[PDB]
Amino acid sequence: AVTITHLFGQTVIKEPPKRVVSAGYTEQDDLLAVDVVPIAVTDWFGDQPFAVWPWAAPKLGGARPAVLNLDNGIQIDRIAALKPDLIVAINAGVDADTYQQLSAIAPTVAQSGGDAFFEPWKDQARSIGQAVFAADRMRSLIEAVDQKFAAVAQRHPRWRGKKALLLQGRLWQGNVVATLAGWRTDFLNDMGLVIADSIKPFAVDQRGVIPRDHIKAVLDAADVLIWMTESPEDEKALLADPEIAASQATAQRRHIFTSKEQAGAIAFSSVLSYPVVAEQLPPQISQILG
């Protein structure tokens, strides 16, 4: 028997769960990675089959899990009717009230820390690994992710010190939104890249929010710009913006506009999704810096 400790206290899991609800946005990836097929998955975005993205889809096979959604909040009645022996909500934005409500249905694994959404991915992965008795296997999977990105650095020693920015694929009310240096950007550091500090003065929580008249100046501080774009229309809209259009990156073609899959892979930041980032992204960075 394993005992998981989290923000709301301890959860005792007597044996390996045969019925598992994934009540958060990204958890289905770590569960599938250790070959736990959830009976329910919670949709986030992308409108994927059964809310499982292409990298994890082969693991799903012919399984047809219920698809939940957080639009109105956690649907507990649906989770109750599914009658799970385990509920994983790390990423579901659980609070003290909703947790006890989930605990009534079955043992519930909540987030460990002050982040109700999107705690550091390794913490989420390790927690899931222990809960499903996959702990040794999960450790190997995490180590494999670090290996992949490190191998990119070794293959591209010239990239070291080059400045990059990781940006959302859409403007918010005319403003560029950058991912601040943190665990989310660690995969870029592993490749040897540095996050341009031009975004630091504009920091809000884990994101920089760039005023319009600061956009060109902030972008021009970077050698390569990675926009996480979910469709061709996202890219067109960004290139139509005069600040972005007049940036050095446009003239010098320093822009990387991700595919929906690539954006989703970054967004999920899982043991399954990150390997996709390590494969598909560096060839695009190579054409620019190279």
Applying CB under 5 A, the residues found at the interface with Cl ion are: 136-137
Phi, psi of 7 (to 5 degrees): -55, -35
Q: Closest approach of Cβ 135 to Cl ion, in Å?
A: 6
CB 122, min distance to Cl ion, A: 5
Nearest residue to Cl ion on Cβ basis: 136
Smallest separation, CB 195 to Cl ion (Å): 19
Q: Between 105 and 188, whose beta carbon lies closer to Cl ion?
A: 188
Burial 164-201 (b: 16+ CB within 10 A, else e): bbbbbbebeeebbbbbbbeebbbbbebbbbbbbebbee
Residue 248 contacts residue 220 (beta carbons within 8 Å)? yes
Residue 14 CB neighbour total at 10 angstroms: 9
Listed residue (91, 89, 67, 88) closest to 78, CA to CA: 67
Kindly tell me which of 98 and 127 has the beta carbon lying closer to Cl ion.
127
Residue 286 Cβ vs Cl ion, minimum distance, rounded to whole Å = 14
Q: What does 270-282 look like in DSSP terms, one character per residue?
A: -TTTHHHHHHHHH
Give the C-alpha separation, 181 to 56, whole Å: 27
Toward Cl ion, which CB reaches closer, 78 or 137? Answer: 137
Q: Give me the least distance between CB of 124 and Cl ion, in Å please.
A: 12
The smaller minimum CB distance to Cl ion, of residues 156 and 216, is found at 156
Tokens of 144: 């494999």
CB of 182 to Cl ion, least distance (A): 13
Q: Which is nearer to Cl ion, 137 or 212 (CB)?
A: 137
Give the nearer residue to Cl ion in terms of CB position, either 5 or 100.
5
Tell me how far apart the alpha carbons of residues 74 and 185 are, in angstroms, rounded to a whole number. 29
Shortest Å, Cβ 267 to Cl ion: 20
Stretch (H or E) spanning 41: strand 40-43
Residue whose CB is less far from Cl ion, 235 or 279: 279
Are the C-beta atoms of 198 and 182 separated by less than 8 Å? Answer: no
Name the phi and psi angles at 169, rounded to 5.
Answer: -75, -10
Least distance (Å) between residue 102 CB and Cl ion: 26
- Closer to Cl ion by Cβ: residue 19 or 122: 122
Q: Kind and range of the H or E element at 142?
A: helix 135-155
Degrees, nearest 5: CA angle 132-134-139: 135
